[PDB]
Amino acid sequence: NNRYSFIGGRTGQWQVVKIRNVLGPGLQLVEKVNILNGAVAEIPLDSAWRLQGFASNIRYAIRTELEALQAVQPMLNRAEAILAVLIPIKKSAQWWEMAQDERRDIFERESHHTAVGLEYLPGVARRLLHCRDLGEEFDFLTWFEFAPEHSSAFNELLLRMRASKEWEYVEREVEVWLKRL
Amino acid sequence: NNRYSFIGGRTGQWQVVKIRNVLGPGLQLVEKVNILNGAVAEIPLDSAWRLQGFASNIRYAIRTELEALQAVQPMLNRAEAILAVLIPIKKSAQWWEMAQDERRDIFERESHHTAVGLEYLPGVARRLLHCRDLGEEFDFLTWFEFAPEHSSAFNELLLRMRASKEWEYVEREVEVWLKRL
Numbered sequence: 001n002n003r004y005s006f007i008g009g010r011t012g013q014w015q016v017v018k019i020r021n022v023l024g025p026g027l028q029l030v031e032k033v034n035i036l037n038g039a040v041a042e043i044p045l046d047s048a049w050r051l052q053g054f055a056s057n058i059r060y061a062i063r064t065e066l067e068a069l070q071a072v073q074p075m076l077n078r079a080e081a082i083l084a085v086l087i088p089i090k091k092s093a094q095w096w097e098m099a100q101d102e103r104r105d106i107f108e109r110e111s112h113h114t115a116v117g118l119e120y121l122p123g124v125a126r127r128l129l130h131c132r133d134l135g136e137e138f139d140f141l142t143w144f145e146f147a148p149e150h151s152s153a154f155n156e157l158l159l160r161m162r163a164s165k166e167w168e169y170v171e172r173e174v175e176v177w178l179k180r181l
Numbered sequence: 182n183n184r185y186s187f188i189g190g191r192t193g194q195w196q197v198v199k200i201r202n203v204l205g206p207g208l209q210l211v212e213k214v215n216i217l218n219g220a221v222a223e224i225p226l227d228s229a230w231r232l233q234g235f236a237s238n239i240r241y242a243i244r245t246e247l248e249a250l251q252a253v254q255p256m257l258n259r260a261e262a263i264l265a266v267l268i269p270i271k272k273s274a275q276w277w278e279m280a281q282d283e284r285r286d287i288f289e290r291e292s293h294h295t296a297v298g299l300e301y302l303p304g305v306a307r308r309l310l311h312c313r314d315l316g317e318e319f320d321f322l323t324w325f326e327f328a329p330e331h332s333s334a335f336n337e338l339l340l341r342m343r344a345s346k347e348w349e350y351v352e353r354e355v356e357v358w359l360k361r362l
C-alpha cells in the first residue's frame with residue numbers, strides 16, 4: 001500500500017518532543033503520533049489531526065542523481081535512528097502553475113536540493129509522500145530519521161534549504177519532532 | 182474537486198458507441214457512461230465498472246510546449262464536440278522505475294508526443310487524469326472529444342501514438358467510444 005497516515009493524539013509508536021509552527025497555520029500540540037500504512041477515514045478517538053499521503057514515482061531526479069542517492073542513502077528503521085522529524089509542506093499556486101523545466105530548474109539548478117541533501121547522508125534517512133492530489137491542506141509530508149549524534153547537522157540542513165530559491169514558494173511549514181518508543 | 186469518476190452502466194450523459202479492447206483485459210460493454218466530478222464509493226446499481234482519477238500538475242511539458250498548446254487547444258464542451266473517447270492506459274513497472282530524464286527523453290525526444298498531438302489541434306479537445314497513485318488498475322484516464330468530421334484524423338492519431346517508443350511501455354489500453362446524449 002502506497003498510502004501512509006499520521007494521526008496526532010494520545011497513542012502511537014512515536015512521542016512528540018516538540019512542534020514548531022515555522023510558516024502559516026500550525027498543528028495542535030499532541031503527545032504522540034500513530035503511523036499507519038493505509039487510509040484512515042475513521043477519525044480516531046482523542047486525536048487532534050490526521051495527515052496522509054502516498055508514495056509515488058520520481059518527479060525531478062535524473063538517473064545520475066538517483067545513482068548517487070542509492071550509493072549512500074540509509075534504510076528506514078535502523079536501530080540507532082531513534083529521532084524523527086515529520087515536516088508537512090505546502091507550495092504556492094504560482095509554483096504549481098509553472099511548467100516542468102521551470103520547476104526542475106528552481107529545484108536543482110538554482111537550489112541544489114539534491115546536492116545539498118546528499119551532504120547529510122548517510123546520517124539522515126528520509127521518506128517522501130505526496131498529498132496535493134488527495135486534496136489535503138498540505139502538498140507534501142516529509143519524513144526524516146536519524147541518531148542523536150546527527151541532530152545538529154539535521155538542523156543545519158533545515159536552515160540551508162529554507163535559504164534556497166525553492167523555499168520562496170513554500171507557503172506553509174510545520175516541523176513535528178519525534179522520539180521512537 | 183480535482184477527482185473525476187466514470188461509471189459504465191445503464192445511465193449517464195454519454196452513450197457507448199463501441200468499446201475496443203486494444204491491449205490487456207477489456208471492459209464490459211455497457212449502454213452509457215455516467216461522469217461525475219467527485220469520488221464515488223457506492224458502486225451504482227446496474228453498473229458494470231467504475232474508473233476514477235484526478236487532475237494534477239504538469240509532469241513533462243516545458244514552458245514553450247505549454248505556450249504552443251495554449252495558443253491552439255480547444256475547451257471541453259464545445260457544442261460541436263458530440264463524439265468522445267475515453268482511453269484508460271497502464272504503463273509497465275519498468276517505465277515507473279525509470280528516472281525523470283529517461284522518461285522525458287522517451288516521451289518527447291524519442292516519441293514526439295506533444296509535437297504529434299499538436300497536429301490534431303484544434304479539432305481535438307482532451308483531458309488527462311492520473312490514477313496510479315490511487316491504487317487503480319489503470320495508471321491514466323485520457324479523454325478526447327471532437328466533432329464527427331474529425332473521427333478519421335483521431336483514428337490516425339491513435340495508430341501513430343501506438344507506433345511510438347513510448348507505447349512499448351504500455352501494457353493495458355481500452356478505447357471507449359461515446360456520443361453525447
Ligand code: HEM
Nearest residue numbers: 057058059060061087089114117118120124126140142161
Ligand atoms: C536529507 C537529504 C535530502 C535529500 C537527499 C533529499 C532529496 C530529495 C530528492 C532527490 C527529491 C526529488 C524527488 C523526486 O524527483 O520526485 C526531493 C524532493 C523533496 N524534498 Fe528533499 N531531500 C532531502 C532533505 C529534505 C528536507 C529536509 C526537506 C524539507 C524540510 C525536503 C523537502 C523536499 C520536498 C518538499 C520535496 C518534493 C518537492 C516537489 O516534488 O515539489 N528534503 N528530496
Ligand code: HEM
Nearest residue numbers: 238239240241242268270295298299301305307321323342
Ligand atoms: C490529441 C492531442 C494530444 C496532445 C496535444 C497531447 C499532449 C499531451 C501532453 C502535453 C502530455 C504531458 C502532460 C504533462 O506534462 O503532465 C500528455 C500526456 C499524456 N498523453 Fe497525450 N496528448 C494527446 C493525445 C493523446 C492520446 C491520443 C493518448 C492516448 C491514447 C495520450 C496519452 C497521454 C498519456 C498517457 C499521458 C501521460 C504520460 C505519462 O505521465 O507517462 N495523449 N499528452
Ligand SMILES: [Cl-]
Nearest residue numbers: 126127128129
Ligand atoms: Cl523518497
Ligand SMILES: [Cl-]
Nearest residue numbers: 307308309310
Ligand atoms: Cl490535460
